[PDB]
Amino acid sequence: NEKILIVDDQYGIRILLNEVFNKEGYQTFQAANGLQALDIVTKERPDLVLLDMKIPGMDGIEILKRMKVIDENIRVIIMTAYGELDMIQESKELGALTHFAKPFDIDEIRDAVKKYLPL
């Protein structure tokens, strides 16, 4: 079906995001590293990428630049802290659909993926 990659190191949030979109009808993938994420982009060509900018090892701005290079049309929605205004701008520069600050409203994320990635 339509595929969603979830790149999040916060286990509970990842497992929650996973269960929601799976219930919705999307085929989902999980990642906890930038490296594991890049791999799934290259193999699975997912439609939407939900990316926590706070991932282990690689910085979100770099895993985003890299995803772009693999698939110039990759659609990413970044998750960040409300006070990271310059970083939020950069992602915007790079091609982030939008961004949600953590902690977020799971209903708000659920509504955005359906608005950008209509199943």
Curated annotation (Swiss-Prot):
This is Sporulation initiation phosphotransferase F. It comes from Bacillus subtilis (strain 168). Its cofactor is Mg(2+). Phosphorylated by KinA and KinB. Dephosphorylated by RapA and RapB. One of its GO terms (cellular component) is cytoplasm. Gene3D superfamilies: 3.40.50.2300. The modification 4-aspartylphosphate is found at residue 52. The keyword Phosphoprotein applies. One of its GO terms (biological process) is phosphorelay signal transduction system. Binds 1 Mg(2+) ion per subunit. The gene is spo0F.
